[PDB]
From a paper:
P44S but not P169S was detected in a 70% proportion in R-Ap35, as evidenced by analysis of both the consensus sequences and their corresponding mutant spectra. These results suggest that the three substitutions in 3D were selected sequentially during replication in the presence of increasing concentrations of R: first M296I, then P44S and finally P169S. To identify possible structural modifications of the viral polymerase associated with the important alterations of the mutational spectrum in progeny RNA, and to investigate how these modifications can affect RNA binding and polymerase activity, the different mutant 3Ds were incubated with the heteropolymeric sym/sub-U RNA of sequence 5′GCAUGGGCCC3′, crystallized, and analyzed by X-ray diffraction.
Subtle domain movements, in particular a ∼1° rotation of the thumb domains relative to the fingers, were observed between the unbound, tetragonal, and the RNA-bound, trigonal structures when the individual domains were superimposed. As a consequence of this rotation, the active site appeared more closed in the unbound state. Thus, the changes observed seem to be a consequence of either RNA-binding, or of the different packing constraints in the tetragonal and trigonal space groups or both, but they do not seem to be related to the presence of substitutions P44S or P169S. Finally, P169 is a non-conserved residue located in motif F of 3D that has been implicated in the recognition of the triphosphate moiety of the incoming nucleotide. P169 is close to 3D residues that directly contact with either the triphosphate or ribose moieties of the incoming nucleotide. However, we can not exclude that a change at this position could also affect the recognition of an incoming nucleotide, modulating its incorporation rate, and thus altering the replication fidelity or replicative fitness.
Author numbering: 1 to 476
Write the structure that this text describes.
């Protein structure tokens, strides 16, 4: 986005500056070129001269202003996508009640009861429990008053900046490229869910190439569904964005919200309004208040879905700006936020699409970065989606999601204190698709120290998950 205003106020917003992540027994074996991000300015690992709270906001390099003709094309692509989207999902997008927003419905998980509350509740020293009863799905006096303010459309707020405690590549750790979570007030998250929660549940349930969304998918079972779909196309592209979230221009965000969340699609009018409050934001970090115009915040209860919607419209936009007679069935795509796989039977010149994405403020590069950019003739087995490859399991004939060994090694090299046993079982769920030999090697350092699930047990669990009848039949 565009930093338009920076001022200092006499009230500090304290941030988490001590890492919860610690090395495991695997760190000594795998020696990964990875580590926890910098949470302090005076981290000894940082390049001696880097200022942490200048790199974390360096992503804000402006807010691209689109011309009239480009805006008119964007609205047309947004409307056509909304058309396809609501054709599949339906028009049952009536507001969720206070109770349903807290407890969640079928397709939407409950609100997290213990996570960060937001502002100004963090200054009052109040946890999420003091504001909202998560047991009974009711609200206290504080949230109640704010929800009434959101109905009148007079509610203003601040975003709280947290440093993301996570594993990052040593080059990024050393360069101070720590990511940030923009924690929004708990009432905003609740009300956003109230306004578009029903829509979000439907998008999770109906995920796939038809709506262009993988939000709500389980890669274990859905990789077969996705793989066989993209295997039928002549050309497949692996597209990468740089700073996808921050580079959403105000024009693109406003027009999208207007075209997708219309009342005629079954939405409450306030659905559009609450999403538009994400466009111009104020961010609180220590003594500094930074006003940003444009870009998506990280902590909205629908960032993945909003990002995914924009991604779909960007592809439609860029192709229509370059070629004539381009429709939704000219190509096919799956998206999860910034992550994207595109396919077509047409020889689409994606290299030529670069400045067309630039008119939206977005920069595209091929994932498997090779000489002279994007190339034709790539298939589904060549690409990466959600950090997973599309490999054929030769025992069943189904596509399996395979993560790279370096990534698995990195994930296994660090954990929060006391969570190791739970993390191991979870990562084993991902490591099973790498095969018996790699699986065994990856969990070698943990043997005798923790319970490691047998490859056999997890393989059989998977076969039934993807196709019950197959595992039923495999007993012929
Ligand atoms: Mg990718």
């Amino acid at each position: 986005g565009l930093i338009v205003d920076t001022r200092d106020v006499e009230e500090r917003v304290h941030v988490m500056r001590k890492t919860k992540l610690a090395p495991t027994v695997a760190h000594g074996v795998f020696n990964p070129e990875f580590g926890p991000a910098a949470l302090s300015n005076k981290d000894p690992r940082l390049n001696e001269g880097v200022v942490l709270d200048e790199v974390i906001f360096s992503k804000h390099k402006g807010d691209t202003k689109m011309s009239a003709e480009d805006k008119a094309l964007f609205r047309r692509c947004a409307a056509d996508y909304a058309s396809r989207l609501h054709s599949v999902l339906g028009t049952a997008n009536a507001p969720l009640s206070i109770y349903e927003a807290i407890k969640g419905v079928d397709g939407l998980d409950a609100m997290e009861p213990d996570t960060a509350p937001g502002l100004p509740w963090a200054l009052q020293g109040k946890r999420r429990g003091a504001l909202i009863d998560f047991e009974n799905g009711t609200v206290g006096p504080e949230v109640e008053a704010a929800l009434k303010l959101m109905e009148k459309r007079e509610y203003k707020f601040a975003c709280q900046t947290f440093l993301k405690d996570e594993i990052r590549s040593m080059e990024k750790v050393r360069a101070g490229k720590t990511r940030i979570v923009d924690v929004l007030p708990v009432e905003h998250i609740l009300y956003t869910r109230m306004m578009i929660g029903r829509f979000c549940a439907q998008m999770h349930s109906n995920n796939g190439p038809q709506i262009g969304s993988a939000v709500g998918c389980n890669p274990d079972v859905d990789w077969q569904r996705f793989g066989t779909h993209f295997a039928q196309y002549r050309n497949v592209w692996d597209v990468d964005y740089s700073a996808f979230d921050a580079n959403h221009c105000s024009d693109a965000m406003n027009i999208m919200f207007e075209e997708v969340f219309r009342t005629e699609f079954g939405f409450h009018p306030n659905a559009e309004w609450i999403l538009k409050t994400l466009v111009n934001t104020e961010h609180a970090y220590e003594n500094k208040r930074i006003t940003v115009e444009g870009g998506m915040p990280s902590g909205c209860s629908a960032t993945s879905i909003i990002n995914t919607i924009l991604n779909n419209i960007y592809v439609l936009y860029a192709l229509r700006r370059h070629y004539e007679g381009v429709e939704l069935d000219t190509y096919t795509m799956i998206s999860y936020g910034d992550d994207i796989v595109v396919a077509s039977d047409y020889d689409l010149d994606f290299e030529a699409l670069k400045p067309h994405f630039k008119s939206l403020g977005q920069t595209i590069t091929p994932a498997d970065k090779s000489d002279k950019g994007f190339v034709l003739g790539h298939s589904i087995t060549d690409v990466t989606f959600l950090k997973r490859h599309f490999h054929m399991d030769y025992g069943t004939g189904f596509y399996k999601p395979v993560m790279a060994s370096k990534t698995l090694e990195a994930i296994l090299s660090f954990a929060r204190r006391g969570t190791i046993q739970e993390k191991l079982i979870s990562v084993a769920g991902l490591a099973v698709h790498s095969g018996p030999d790699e699986y065994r090697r990856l969990f070698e350092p943990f043997q005798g120290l923790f319970e490691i699930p047998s490859y056999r047990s997890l393989y059989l669990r998977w076969v039934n998950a993807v196709c019950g009848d197959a595992a039923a039949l495999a007993h012929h």
